[PDB]
Design a protein around this ligand. Structure first.
Ligand code: SF4
Ligand code: F3S
Length: 106
């Protein structure tokens, strides 16, 4: 499974979904998640994230291991997203800001 981490929050560019062959991205208010059981580890989404927020589980940074279980949990509750949409208005200002998990909305 590929996992979306911190920098996606409040950026949510959704470029990653255009490339997914199986459509396993699920949508929240200000973040996206990959459903771990449906992902086929094709790695096609990882170059597409402008925020460089997607990682293979085995390369998820040490301080971001919470995201592995979070993507799994939330993929079960959020709706599927299969088409790109515009970034959140302010995506650029928040791109690179650290600690954005405190801003996640369910
Ligand atoms: S690695 Fe492939 S199947 Fe998994 S979320 Fe990314 S694009 Fe979709
Ligand atoms: S910012 Fe998030 S919505 Fe996709 S393109 Fe990157 S993982």
């Amino acid at each position: 499974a590929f996992v979306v981490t911190d920098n996606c929050i409040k950026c949510k560019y959704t470029d990653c979904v255009e490339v997914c062959p199986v459509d396993c991205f699920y949508e929240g208010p200000n973040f996206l998640v990959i459903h771990p059981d449906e992902c086929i580890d094709c790695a096609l989404c990882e170059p597409e994230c402008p925020a460089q927020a997607i990682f293979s589980e085995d390369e998820v940074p040490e301080d971001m291991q919470e995201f592995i279980q979070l993507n799994a949990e939330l993929a079960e509750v959020w709706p599927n997203i299969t088409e790109k949409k515009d970034p959140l208005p302010d995506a650029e200002d928040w791109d690179g800001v650290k600690g954005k998990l405190q801003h996640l909305e369910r």
